Every structure is written in C-alpha cells, then in structure tokens.
Amino acid sequence: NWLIAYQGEPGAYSEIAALRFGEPLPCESFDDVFSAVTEQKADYAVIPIENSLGGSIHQNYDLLLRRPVVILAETFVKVEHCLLGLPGASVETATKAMSHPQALVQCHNFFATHPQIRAEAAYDTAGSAKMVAESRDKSALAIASKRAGELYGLDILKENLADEEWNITRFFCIAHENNPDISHLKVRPDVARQKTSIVFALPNEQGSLFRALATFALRGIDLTKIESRPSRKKAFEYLFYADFIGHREDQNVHNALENLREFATMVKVLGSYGVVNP
Amino acid sequence: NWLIAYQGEPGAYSEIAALRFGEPLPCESFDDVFSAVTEQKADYAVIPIENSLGGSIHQNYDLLLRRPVVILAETFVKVEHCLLGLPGASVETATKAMSHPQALVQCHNFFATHPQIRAEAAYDTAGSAKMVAESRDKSALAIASKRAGELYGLDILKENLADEEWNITRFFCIAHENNPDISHLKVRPDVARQKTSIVFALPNEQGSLFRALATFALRGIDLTKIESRPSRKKAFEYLFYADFIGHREDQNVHNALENLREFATMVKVLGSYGVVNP
Ligand SMILES: N[C@@H](Cc1ccccc1)C(=O)O
Ligand SMILES: N[C@@H](Cc1ccccc1)C(=O)O
Numbered sequence: 359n360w361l362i363a364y365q366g367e368p369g370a371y372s373e374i375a376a377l378r379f380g381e382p383l384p385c386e387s388f389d390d391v392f393s394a395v396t397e398q399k400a401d402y403a404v405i406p407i408e409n410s411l412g413g414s415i416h417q418n419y420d421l422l423l424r425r426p427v428v429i430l431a432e433t434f435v436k437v438e439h440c441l442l443g444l445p446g447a448s449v450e451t452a453t454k455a456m457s458h459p460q461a462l463v464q465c466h467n468f469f470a471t472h473p474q475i476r477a478e479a480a481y482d483t484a485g486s487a488k489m490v491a492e493s494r495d496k497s498a499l500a501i502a503s504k505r506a507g508e509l510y511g512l513d514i515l516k517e518n519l520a521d522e523e524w525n526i527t528r529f530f531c532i533a534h535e536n537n538p539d540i541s542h543l544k545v546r547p548d549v550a551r552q553k554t555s556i557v558f559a560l561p562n563e564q565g566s567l568f569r570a571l572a573t574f575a576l577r578g579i580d581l582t583k584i585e586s587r588p589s590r591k592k593a594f595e596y597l598f599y600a601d602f603i604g605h606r607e608d609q610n611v612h613n614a615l616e617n618l619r620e621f622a623t624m625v626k627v628l629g630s631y632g633v634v635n636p
Numbered sequence: 637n638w639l640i641a642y643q644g645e646p647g648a649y650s651e652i653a654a655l656r657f658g659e660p661l662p663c664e665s666f667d668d669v670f671s672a673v674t675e676q677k678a679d680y681a682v683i684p685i686e687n688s689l690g691g692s693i694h695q696n697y698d699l700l701l702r703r704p705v706v707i708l709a710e711t712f713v714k715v716e717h718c719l720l721g722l723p724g725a726s727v728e729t730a731t732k733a734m735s736h737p738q739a740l741v742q743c744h745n746f747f748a749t750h751p752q753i754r755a756e757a758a759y760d761t762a763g764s765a766k767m768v769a770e771s772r773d774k775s776a777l778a779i780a781s782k783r784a785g786e787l788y789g790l791d792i793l794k795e796n797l798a799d800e801e802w803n804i805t806r807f808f809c810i811a812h813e814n815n816p817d818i819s820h821l822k823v824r825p826d827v828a829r830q831k832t833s834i835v836f837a838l839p840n841e842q843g844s845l846f847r848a849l850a851t852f853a854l855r856g857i858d859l860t861k862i863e864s865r866p867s868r869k870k871a872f873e874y875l876f877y878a879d880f881i882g883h884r885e886d887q888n889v890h891n892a893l894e895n896l897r898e899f900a901t902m903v904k905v906l907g908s909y910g911v912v913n914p
Contacts (some may be wrong), residue, residue: 387744389799410865413691417800458737459759466665481737481757524868567862568846568853575846584845585863587688590802 369506547632647762647784707907
C-alpha cells in the first residue's frame with residue numbers, strides 16, 4: 359500500500375503531511391488512523407504528535423505505546439492560515455470567514471480590525487474551504503490551508519492571518535512494527551542526524567529521573583525531548599517520553615537502553631528515524 | 637466576593653475553574669485574561685495549563701513567563717461532557733448535536749452509534765447549550781458541561797458521552813506579581829504538600845538537563861513535572877518546565893534554585909502554591 363492514513367479531509371494540515379510521504383487515505387479519527395495500519399488498509403500513517411502552541415498529543419502517545427506500530431520518519435508542518443475567497447476576491451465585500459474555532463481565535467486580530475466580517479464556527483478548516491466553493495457565494499470567506507485554497511480553487515486574500523508564525527505541528531509517519539518499510543515512502547528520511555523515540559515508566563521515587571537521564575547523559579548521548587505525565591492505573595508511576603540523537607542499534611545506545619531496563623518499569627522504543635522536509 | 641478572570645462564557649470549564657476562586661469575569665482572549673490582571677480590571681485569573689489528553693498549553697506558559705504574574709493555586713477540572721436538551725427532548729427524537737468540534741470528536745463513538753443525530757460544529761460548548769435554549773426546538777441538542785445545562789435549564793440526557801473516561805484540565809489561579817494576596821480567594825489552597833513551578837532555559841550542551849536535575853535530585857527534592865521545548869527566542873536552547881514539591885524559600889529548594897541559576901541561561905519561579913479541591 360502507498361496509502362498514508364490520516365485524520366481529516368483534503369487540504370487539512372494532516373493531509374499536507376501525508377503528502378510528504380504518499381497517497382493520503384483520510385480517516386474519521388486518530389483511533390481510526392492507527393487502525394488503517396493495524397488491519398492493513400494502509401501501510402503508513404502520519405500522526406500529529408506535538409504543536410508548538412498546544413502540547414504533546416497524549417492520545418497519540420497512548421496509541422503509539424499500545425499499537426504494534428513503529429515510527430519511520432518525522433515531519434514538521436508550519437500551520438499558516440490563509441484567508442480564502444472565491445475568484446473575484448474581496449475582503450471589503452465579505453460578511454464572514456468560517457473556520458475551526460481555534461483558527462478563529464488564532465486570527466483574533468484580523469477579526470477585531472475587520473468587524474464587517476464575523477467569525478463563523480466550522481467543523482474544521484478544510485471543510486470551511488469546501489463550503490465557500492459549493493455555496494457559490496463570494497460573500498463568505500474561509501480561513502484555511504493554502505492547499506485547501508489550491509484545491510477548492512479559491513484565491514488567497516491574506517497570508518499569515520494569525521499573528522503567529524511558529525505555529526508548527528510535528529507528525530510521525532508510522533508503519534506496523536513487523537515491517538519498518540522505508541523503501542515505499544515518497545522521499546526517504548534524512549538520516550544524517552537520526553533520532554530515537556522511547557517511552558518509559560518509572561516508579562515515582564525521589565531521584566528516579568536523574569537516574570534515568572544518567573543513562574544517556576553519562577554515555578555522551580544528546581536529548582532533544584523529555585516529558586513526564588502521570589500513569590493513571592499503574593499506582594505511583596510516571597510515564598516519560600524522551601527523544602535523543604542516536605540509532606537504536608548503536609552499541610552506546612543499546613547500552614543506555616539496557617541500563618534503563620534495570621529500573622524502568624517498562625521501556626518501549628517507538629523507533630529510530632530521520633526527517634522529511636518540506 | 638472577588639473577580640476571577642477566565643476565558644470563555646458562563647457554562648465553560650474555565651468558568652467552573654474560575655468559581656473555585658471567586659466571581660468569574662469572562663473574557664474573549666487569554667490576552668484579555670492576563671491584561672485583565674496586569675492592569676487591575678480583575679485581581680486573579682484562572683489559566684488552563686494542561687490537559688491529560690492534549691498536553692501542556694505552550695502558548696499559556698508563554699504568557700505566564702512574559703507576564704508580571706505569580707501562581708497562587710492550582711486546581712484540576714474533570715472535563716465531563718453531557719448531552720443536553722430542552723425539557724421533553726429525546727435522543728430518539730433529536731436531529732442535531734451542537735458542540736465545539738473537539739468535544740464532537742471526543743464523543744465520536746456516540747455519533748457513530750447514533751447516525752440519526754448529526755454532529756454540528758459551534759464556537760464552544762457552553763454557547764451550544766445557549767443556542768439550544770434560545771432556538772426552542774427539542775430536536776437540537778448540545779454537548780456541554782453540566783453547569784452549561786443548569787444555567788440554561790436544559791435537561792441532561794446522557795452523562796459521560798466522551799470516548800475517554802479520563803479528561804482533566806489543570807488550571808492555575810494567578811494574580812499580579814506584587815498583588816499575590818491569598819486572603820481574597822474564596823478558600824485557601826491546601827498547602828500541606830505545597831508545589832513550586834519554575835521555568836528555565838539551558839544552553840543546549842549534551843548533559844545539560846542531567847546537570848540541572850542534579851540540582852534537585854542530589855538535594856532530596858521530588859519532581860512532579862518535567863518537560864522540554866525549544867527556545868523560541870535564543871538560537872541554540874531549550875525551555876524546561878519543572879514542578880517540584882517544596883517552597884521557593886525552603887533551604888533545600890533555594891540552594892537547588894541558586895545552583896541552577898549558576899549555569900541556566902534563565903530561571904523564573906512562576907510560584908509556590910497549594911491546591912484547590914472542588
Ligand atoms: N540536549 C540537551 C538538552 C535537552 C534535554 C532534554 C530535552 C531537550 C533538550 C541534553 O541532552 O541534556
Ligand atoms: N518524582 C520522581 C519522578 C518524576 C520526575 C519528573 C517528573 C515526574 C516524576 C523524581 O523526582 O525524579
């Protein structure tokens with residue numbers, strides 16, 4: 359399969375990401391995206407893992423943890439809103455821009471300055487595009503992806519509509535752990551400074567984490583991420599997410615990992631992977 | 637009784653959180669929320685900081701660091717969705733459910749198992765209970781808090797509509813830096829197991845975090861949160877959120893923090909605070 363499962367519809371930032379890997383299969387949900395891989399509808403999938411403005415997506419992490427799945431690449435999507443109209447395109451004739459409530463909030467400047475234009479709640483940003491194109495009504499605007507504009511044949515009225523640059527979504531392209539297949543991806547991950555992601559669980563002892571970092575830091579190994587959150591039905595544990603620069607088969611790495619399993623209640627390696635660029 | 641600025645409208649979870657602290661003052665932006673304290677329109681604010689399902693809210697940590705403000709308390713709000721309807725309304729009779737797209741998608745099974753009832757996007761959850769009451773048709777329902785339904789005289793048709801039983805948002809009650817008055821909260825925070833929140837930035841050398849954690853760990857100090865993200869501002873660095881148990885001016889803690897301040901690029905204590913139980 360060259361299908362890349364994702365959550366959303368065409369023009370969604372999630373699709374943008376699956377495009378960097380292959381042919382997008384859209385899915386109703388996260389839970390659904392992981393299942394397209396499990397039951398072999400799709401070989402791959404791209405899941406949003408963190409966003410610079412929000413957090414880590416702990417839902418997608420519980421799924422990475424539970425699904426017999428493996429990360430094969432990471433990618434980074436710059437969420438840049440476009441204000442988007444029908445051909446014959448004007449801001450001073452419009453009565454509304456539709457979009458996802460969070461896009462609407464993020465474009466709160468545009469709205470306080472443009473009160474002839476009222477924020478309208480839409481299910482998502484891509485469908486907002488979609489509505490404009492079908493409503494055959496040059497009055498209604500959408501706030502969405504350039505790709506949505508592309509696609510629904512709309513014009514960009516306005517780029518960087520929120521006064522946030524650095525709204526970035528990082529996604530992980532994933533496959534079933536019983537075939538980390540790199541060869542069928544659209545573009546092969548840049549492996550020059552390859553990353554490993556793991557989850558581990560510590561019994562919540564004063565010191566535990568210092569102790570688990572020691573494992574990497576006294577081994578010369580650089581981290582790029584670390585996060586705790588509590589474990590809910592294991593009594594007195596936290597879960598930790600940690601990424602670091604290194605390949606899981608590297609002996610130093612392997613030594614770190616074994617070192618951790620000495621006192622970690624569990625370790626999982628979600629994968630060693632490179633990066634795909636726009 | 638005293639003014640707790642929060643983002644949203646009556647009904648909202650953020651309002652439930654406001655109310656554990658005083659009289660809620662609803663605001664359109666978090667910017668408005670902080671600027672409300674930072675210029676004495678209100679004495680406190682209730683800020684969402686993380687959710688067990690998404691993660692940390694980076695954008696809020698962002699403003700907590702840039703604002704002359706201090707954590708006075710934390711509480712934890714269980715985000716519990718209800719199907720709300722007018723007196724007489726029915727799940728077998730309903731045609732629409734209105735809510736925030738995220739609450740829609742978090743009750744995805746409900747919608748799958750009830751195809752008669754179409755999911756319909758709205759600006760937020762509480763405004764959805766409002767729309768239901770104002771439109772007066774018994775065929776249109778909302779997904780919103782139990783509070784939003786009471787306010788609006790809507791019946792609760794189903795308790796616990798979401799896919800995931802464990803949805804919890806952690807809020808900070810905040811105040812102005814040099815108006816850090818606990819007396820005029822509505823109940824004093826439980827301060828037995830007092831927590832301190834800090835943020836800091838390190839030059840990104842391998843072992844940095846280990847060396848920083850060494851600071852608390854070799855000192856008997858127990859962490860309850862650790863998370864990294866990359867310095868939006870300095871070229872080569874990371875920010876870390878740390879929470880731990882103790883007070884700023886414990887001998888221990890102070891030592892730890894001073895040692896930290898030795899090599900951290902920056903340290904700000906966001907505050908030392910206990911916990912408001914509903
Ligand atoms: N890479 C540095 C700093 C860092 C730690 C953890 C997460 C992100 C960055 C270290 O290895 O200690
Ligand atoms: N409380 C333990 C484990 C822990 C670390 C960091 C965050 C949460 C828990 C410690 O101080 O190391």
